[PDB]
């Protein structure tokens, strides 16, 4: 069974987009409570985002994503990526850059562990940084300069709080919360909420590692796939 393959934080307060294969939902979420609700019922990506129809991002779907600023996000499908405006509340979504390869979008990533795919990503509170995860490795990109910030290390070199959890070996999906500096990390059937600390190993777990459907019961009729 499969769960969440990608996520990103909307410009709209307390909205999140979740991608599952070739489909997605938009959820109005509630930190610390099982009061999340669906705003967009399970829909093909190609329907929600006609700009993506006929691309890898629609079929087989989006396998990594992150929000940047405004109503912009990067989306990924295998080695391909695109910069989009997801234009909430309208039909004005559009591709701003690409589709192209990861290495062409972000030349600093050419020849790195990220060039053939990214597993997960989320927006940092530090500047324009975005966390990138691939296997048990992670780095940070500043989206606006496209600079790799530092080096690509083990997840637990940045996030020792995740030692002894399955997240130490990789993350399937993630997004930054509207409640800063929290983030949600997903791995198969499970998730955890963290408070992250850029440049420090002061990150905390907010609660326990638990099944997604326990914390997000509004998803129980659509997951797993």
Residue numbers in the entry: 1 to 225
Show passages lifted from the paper.
The structure of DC25 determined is at the highest resolution of 1.28 Å and provided better structural insights. The structure shows three monomers per asymmetric unit. Each monomer has a β-propeller domain, typical of the hemopexin superfamily proteins. The β-propeller domain is formed by circularly arranged four blades around the channel perpendicular to the plane of the blades. Each blade is composed of a β-sheet consisting of four antiparallel β-strands. The central channel consisted of four innermost β-strands of the blades, which are arranged in a parallel manner. When the monomers of these proteins were superimposed, it was found that the core β-propeller structure was highly superimposable between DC25 and other three hemopexins from plant seeds with Cα RMSD values in the range of 0.32 Å to 0.54 Å. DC25, being homologous to CP4, LS24 and CAL, shows significant conformational differences in the loops connecting the outermost β-strands between the blades.
The analysis resulted in identification of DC25, a 2S albumin homologue abundant in legumes. For the first time, we report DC25 being a plant origin oxidoreductase having peroxidase activity.
